[model samples]
Target: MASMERFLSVYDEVQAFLLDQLQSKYEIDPNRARYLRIMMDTTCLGGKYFRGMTVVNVAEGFLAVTQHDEATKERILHDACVGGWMIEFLQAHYLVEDDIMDGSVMRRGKPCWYRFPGVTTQCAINDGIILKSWTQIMAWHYFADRPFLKDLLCLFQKVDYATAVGQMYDVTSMCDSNKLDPEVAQPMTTDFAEFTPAIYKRIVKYKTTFYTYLLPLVMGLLVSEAAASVEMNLVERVAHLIGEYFQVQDDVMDCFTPPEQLGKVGTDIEDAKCSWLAVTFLGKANAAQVAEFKANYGEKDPAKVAVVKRLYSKANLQADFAAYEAEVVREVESLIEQLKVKSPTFAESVAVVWEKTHKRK
Candidate 1:
């Protein structure tokens, strides 16, 4: 928790830097400069900075292995910090567009970026694209001389491609009904709730995993140019699992945690989000289950919220979520133990991964 706290504190520095950069680069209007500043500020603020922390942690691993001197390690950490902030910039790019697409009015307890004064919907979309492009430019400039440049570029591109693929599936899932052929969908449930868990897992995997978790650690490994051994594989596996779990925990917090602590109104129910809790409950529900869910679960009624809570209680939804979470954690821990035996560097990476896995909750 202390490590995570330090990470969070450093993350604020990244946000401050971002705000400065946006103001310097974009606040050029004679007319709407204040609005533009507010737009960027709102869009770029309010993340937990987990992505940045992942990059920093991996870089520390790399630095310990490669750099013997303080000067070189400092330089490496500086570069890693820059790269980590670049990841945050990429996140801002995606969320700017996401808010609009999802028709969300608020984020991080404030107006969505697209909702900022003087920001048109069309312009906000383009701004997100520009933000993404800018990060690539920053990467190319910052890492041009690094030995692992090619690998880093490939990893970044891979992350972007994975994210795009996931986004396509997500948008399609929402707009159209899923053709849940039992063999393909895997969970084998006719109920929407039952099937939602599988889909939610898919959503977070492609949506959050590659860029947020895998890419950062990959960046560190590339920078360090660590030995091509099982250690690399362990880092990859650990980061991927941790990233997915990170998203799941976020969903849980949104649905179950208080708004003051979480920083915004919960949207899981409002958005009809397909989550593990919903899916497990639905799968185990009988005729009464189906009736109760339809009457209360997805419907937007205050009374329905209470009724649905009762149904979830009857179905032991929280227990099911806990069991699934524990199973995933055990698998991750077993993998970590295996990696610890293979290489201490990789073990350290897993430690950071574990910190991320448990942070903020």
Candidate 2:
């Protein structure tokens, strides 16, 4: 709780600090400053600060703080906070663009930025780009004297690029993309053949896992001077496994959780985004069920959507998801035990996040 508090307290100040600089550069353009402030508030705040907490926790895990003075420890805290906020910026940028692409109407229990009056798709597109640009500038200013600055910046670039690639794979898997070609312009439809578990896992690893799980953990290591202690191979292994599990839970929640609880209505079925539920439902489905899915899966009509939801309940996905959750906890716990031998502090840090991931229901 205290760890969370330490990080949350700096959020407003950092936001204010960034805008002060952002507006000065745009001296004559007050509207840009106002737009940015709205963007940050709408997209950056309100969600669970899981990634930001992971950043601070992992950094603290790597740093043996009794060796440093109080003032230096404060500096360390501030550094991790900056890194955390940069990820927050990246997240906001991604969501703004994603909302536009997915035509998401609501997020975090409110209307999406693009859905706001006077702020349609085109404006949100520009906002996403501007938000992304500021992350580099923010890092450059804060980490100017640090030796790991290049590594940190490069890591951000690599993660962002990987995420974009993942996003493309995810989109193409669900909808036919040849439709976008100038010569082959045609309407798109859900391609059930592309909805296999293999493809779903691949999409999840690239699209949701890398930036969501690996980036913050690696950023904490890079910032804490602990990069030398652990091998990247092991870190990636843990990250992918944990990330896969995290996304699975997210998929479960999307379909099963109430909108009042989930903060937004789930639309994976309507979007045909190759979700975990879709893959699992396919695995357990028979001829009639398969026919039902074929008829009802991707339709926007409420009755068609009801057919999908009914099929999901018949498949008993919630119980299977619990079993999957149990399996992951066992395997990840074993991995954490191995991690303990290398660095107990880091293992403990991961354990905290692991503990936090489940039981949302």
Candidate 3:
């Protein structure tokens, strides 16, 4: 309960700080400023702040390893909180655009920003661009004079470009149009043959892993006074494994978990997503079973969705997932042990993430 309170406190501080900056930067028309405020408030606030918490927790753990004075610790914590909010800002930017592209109706139990009255889809796109640009502005305001500022900016740019490329792959692979070119645009088919496990891994690594898992750790280490002591290659290695596992679990739960438990309806099947479940079933099923998948997968009808679920049951995916989960845990545990030998604080940070997400619904 105390930790939750601290998190909320930091959340409030970040929101206020961001709003103050936004207000100062755009001191023009009051109505335009009001729209920007609403955009930041609704898009940035709310939702589980797990990614933001990671920045604080990881930085705190790193500070524990160093002998920093009270004043220094406080400064670092303040910077860490801002960095954490930057991450949340970037994520919110992605979600706003993603919700529109996915044709999602609800997010965080509220109508999507694009669906809200007085907000057009065009406005959502521009808002996403504005939100993305804010990260760079905030980075400049906070970290401009720091020695690691250049590296930090570079890291953000690299991740941003990689994520955009990943989105291209994801959207293009599943798109119905071949407007680009026959060779370049690989329109998705319902045959289940195109949704390969290799492609799934590639998409998850770029789309989710780099930003979701690796970025927070990198930011925490950068903010650490002992930033030079951190080994980023090792951090990236462990983060990749953990991030990939996290996304695979997400894919599994999207189909299997109830909407009430998940806090949103699962639309991956209807959206023609290249999910882990779909790729795994395709690889394992026979000709007749594949034929069944073709006829029922990606349909909006609830009965067709049921047919796909039944096929998963028939293939005993739950048992397979159990085995897969055990292996992932074991591998991650072993990697954490290795990381501990190099940096105990970093190991603890990674373990915190593991404990939070390993058996999550």
Candidate number with greatest TM-score = 2
State the C-alpha lDDT per candidate: 0.69, 0.82, 0.79
Give the best candidate by lDDT: 2
lDDT against true structure, model 1:
0.69
Model 1 residue 266 CA deviation (Å) reads 2.0
Instruction: Write model 1 residue lDDT over 1-361, tens digit each, in one string.
Output: 3435555554456445545565688665534544544554566546767777677787677665664688777667766766776777788888888888888777787777777676779779987886777567666766778776677767778888889887765654432355534355433223453256667777778988888777777766665566464466766677778877787777777777787777667766545566655666777889877777766655567787777767777787777777777887797887888877766776668676786577658
Per-residue error (Å), model 3, residue 283: 2.3
TM-score, prediction 1? 0.82
Report how far off residue 7 is in candidate 2 (Å). 2.0
- Rank order by lDDT, top first? 2, 3, 1
Worst 10 residues of 1 by lDDT: 185-194
**Per-residue lDDT for 38-149 in model 3, tens only?**
8888998887777777878888887766888999887777677777778888999988999899898887778888888999897999999889887887789777777768
Better of 1 and 3 by lDDT: 3
What RMSD, rounded to one decimal, does every model reach? Answer: 5.1, 2.2, 2.6
For all candidates, the clash counts are 1, 0, 0
> Against the true structure, what is each candidate's TM-score?
0.82, 0.93, 0.91
